[PDB]
A paper describes a structure:
Monellin, isolated from the African plant Dioscoreophyllum cumminsii, is, together with thaumatin, one of the most potent sweeteners known, being about 90,000 times sweeter than sucrose on a molar basis. Wild type monellin has a cystatin-like fold, composed of two non-covalently linked chains, which dissociate when heated above ~50 °C. This is accompanied by taste loss and prevents the use of the protein as a sweetener above this temperature. To circumvent this inconvenience, single chain derivatives with higher thermostability, among which MNEI, have been designed. All sweet proteins elicit a taste response upon interaction with the human taste receptor T1R2-T1R3, a heterodimeric G-protein coupled receptor (GPCR) located on specialised cells on the tongue.
Author numbering: 1 to 46, 56 to 96
The structure:
């Protein structure tokens, strides 16, 4: 596919909420509270999309990679790591 910078509107914020909810199921960083997705957010095409976000949760910053299937709209958290340096 092709990588691009995308906005941080509702769609993108919800991807960040998803990432935190999925992290919380795994419990890797304990139970986090989604704050916000900050810039920059990146998207690639895959049949679907891959998203790489900076996610603020419980006042710390994480990087999350999320995939989304085009036809079903089903999502997967691929990676959730941090804390990371600010962009």
């Amino acid at each position: 596919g092709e990588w691009e910078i995308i906005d941080i509107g509702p769609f993108t914020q919800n991807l960040g909420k998803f990432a935190v909810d999925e992290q919380n199921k795994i419990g890797k960083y304990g139970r986090l509270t989604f704050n916000k997705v900050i810039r920059p957010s990146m998207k690639k095409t895959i049949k679907g999309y891959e998203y790489q976000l900076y996610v603020r949760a419980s006042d710390k910053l994480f990087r999350a990679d999320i995939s989304e299937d085009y036809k079903t709209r089903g999502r997967k958290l691929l990676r959730f790591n941090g804390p990371v340096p600010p962009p």
